[PDB]
Design a protein around this ligand. Structure first.
Ligand SMILES: Cc1ncc(COP(=O)(O)O)c(C=O)c1O
Ligand SMILES: Cc1ncc(COP(=O)(O)O)c(C=O)c1O
Lengths: 411, 412
């Protein structure tokens, strides 16, 4: 009698995971990991935000708190603070009570329960054939999350232009123009992962024009608000524009990066509708999905975010911490670009500073990446994506020289 | 203007406890009692943060070396091994033989969901959504929903509660297992059956295991009350550990919501026991894929509290003392309620009040009798007759017992 698990195969390995394992085992003293999936300081360390440390101390010393179940949809002050952060204090959607918020297990959890809701209630009853459009390329897990919710038809829209090292707007618009009516479109609100290149506001207006015409459902992924540029309002421009254009949409918010709270799993699904009463019905269906997935959400991370966003002094301290990370990212991009151009590297390198956020498509091809990894011990994905916060004052000259060698030696 | 894309979304109905609690809240009658809270409450009707949890929370807050970087997908390693070791026992042969895996999950619900998702994909075939899933009659209100969300199309009941004798219908239970198709999944309450409170005895568990072994039934244990149920961690895990020694492969969804009082930190563990070490590693690799598309990786704070407690002998002993305090109060409320009903010469028998264990009790009242308690005496409980025993207090015990006496004598 064989094990009931005897035929269970070994799951496919994750590229990022193996890359970091390879870096860890590398004895070369020049090695650099540009494939970390989180913010790191100039000393290659994690950074707990000072405001988070401060609030955690307050929480630990607050004997009025208990551990009883949160509401299914989550902590009320977190949900309202989170949605207001995305939409702005003066949002007409908030004033008109057309907004709901579901606390979730990070951005991933928000995407999941939103996809589960759409797969049951959107565009008909249990309609799993609604096309879901993701960017080419996109965050690895987008396809997997929507597939897990049951969607049978995941498609891509053109986005990264590898020749221009920038946004292929014409291809993006043409793919949307050919999307079946009511298709779901997964949009990066700001700091596109993995490329770092965002549509400009003028480009967003062209994108919204096609989506409005073909009744496409925007599903925003907002994982980097404030973290991307240091400016919360600017990083929310596209979301707030879609509000004012009258779209109904979902917005999956993560607080993993902009609060540094990765392992407390703090997210919010913001829902924007045309009318207040059906938003309440959406929320009641979201409760059913939550109850059969994680029952109700954890308190610690949401309590930190809610306390920060609702205290004006903590809020201003937080914005300072976020600007510290955004400023470091900005500086590493400027310094890498400057050194590449000083070395007379072929090609253009303004994309390094045109992009925003912690991830950058360098424009290197897989053979050039293989040179960096194998001969220079600089670890990055074959896609050419780097974590810009993996660059430091101490390794910048080595990384820029190695990229110069990769570009000049390898076609 | 065109209609909202949400215009046809109907209102979902909320769980019975929400309405019961709002009705209680809005009741102006000063004698009112809420016997339908879904968590432990003290003799003063308040929540209880365990002292050991307060102490460990201080330790965590003062540990400057902790960061917030993503945990591994399967969770905090020290929590997973401590949780599985808590359920299986330090000297478990499965642990020594490396036949065990553990997945940190979002409470017991999250563990049930991940395990159900795995079974719906890899067990009894590939993508077999037709494997029958058996749950007790009655059972925890979300068992059906969780396995249905995993895709299972055939969710069945096994007889369990006998309303006439106020106890376990072991013969009906065993006959339902005998007729189950081979490889059917059976969701078993490890201890402190929810909602009834009545558990199989160890000798009754041996008969259950015999049928399940003969019919190749898959045990999916729900272990939400270990230690909390009786105050003794070893006794509360006896059924699980007997299934290990009988050679079963199985899942066990563990919750630390009750026995640590960490309800809102969502601390659970899915323990997997298999025949062979290397297929367990492949099971875990598939659990990672499922976690990745559900919550990506699990939260740290509650797991850190449990891990810190279970890995330190001094904290573990404080914790077991705290757990015994809750178990002893529940045990006392049961004994006092029974003694008061028998002193009032209440018709029927009432040893089921003390035969049951854990926070929840099927009182054996019928819906007409419950309706009296709610409408006339303002004692709030579910139409099934389930009460939360920790809703009883030294102050309300005579009013509740007197009211149950009235209900039983006035209404047939
Ligand atoms: C675009 C994008 N979506 C979703 C996520 C997942 O975030 P979380 O870890 O909060 O689930 C990430 C990273 O935070 C991301 O970059
Ligand atoms: C039998 C049973 N299973 C599962 C659960 C769910 O536990 P959690 O809140 O940790 O998800 C409960 C909690 O009381 C329960 O009683």
């Amino acid at each position: 009698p064989p094990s009931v698990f005897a035929e269970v195969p070994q799951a496919q390995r994750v590229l990022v995971f193996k890359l970091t394992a390879d870096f860890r085992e590398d004895p070369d003293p020049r090695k650099v990991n540009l494939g970390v999936g989180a913010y790191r300081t100039d000393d290659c360390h994690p950074w707990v935000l000072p405001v988070v440390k401060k609030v955690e101390q307050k929480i630990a010393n607050d004997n009025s708190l208990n551990h009883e179940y949160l509401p299914i949809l989550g902590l009320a002050e977190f949900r309202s603070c989170a949605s207001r952060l995305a939409l702005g204090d003066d949002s007409p959607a908030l004033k008109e009570k057309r907004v709901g918020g579901v606390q979730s297990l990070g951005g991933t959890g928000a995407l999941r329960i939103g996809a589960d809701f759409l797969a049951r209630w959107y565009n008909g009853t249990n309609n799993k054939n609604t096309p879901v459009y993701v960017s080419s390329p996109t965050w690895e897990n987008h396809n997997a999350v929507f597939s897990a919710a049951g969607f049978k038809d995941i498609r891509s829209y053109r986005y990264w232009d590898a020749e221009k090292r920038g946004l292929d707007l014409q291809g993006f618009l043409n793919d949307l123009e050919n999307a079946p009516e009511f298709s779901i479109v997964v949009l990066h609100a700001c700091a596109h992962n993995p490329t770092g290149i965002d549509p400009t506001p003028e480009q967003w207006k062209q994108i919204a024009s096609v989506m409005k015409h073909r009744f496409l459902f925007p599903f925003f992924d907002s994982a980097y608000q404030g973290f991307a540029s240091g400016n919360l309002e600017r990083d929310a421009w596209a979301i707030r524009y879609f509000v004012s254009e009258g779209f109904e949409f979902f917005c999956a918010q993560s607080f993993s990066k902009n609060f540094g709270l990765y392992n407390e799993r703090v997210g919010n699904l913001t829902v924007v509708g045309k009318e207040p009463e059906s938003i309440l019905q959406v929320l009641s269906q979201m409760e059913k999905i939550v109850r059969i997935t994680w029952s109700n959400p954890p308190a610690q991370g949401a309590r930190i975010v809610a306390s920060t966003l609702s205290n004006p002094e903590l809020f201003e301290e937080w914005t300072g911490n976020v600007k510290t990370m955004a400023d470091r990212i900005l500086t590493m991009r400027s310094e890498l670009r400057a050194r590449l151009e000083a070395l007379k590297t072929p090609g253009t390198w303004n994309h390094i500073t045109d992009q925003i956020g912690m991830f950058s498509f360098t424009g290197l091809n897989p053979k050039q990446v293989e040179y960096l990894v194998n001969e220079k011990h600089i670890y990055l994905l074959p896609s050419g994506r780097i974590n810009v916060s993996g660059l430091t004052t101490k390794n910048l000259d080595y990384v820029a020289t190695s990229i110069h060698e990769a570009v000049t030696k390898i076609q």
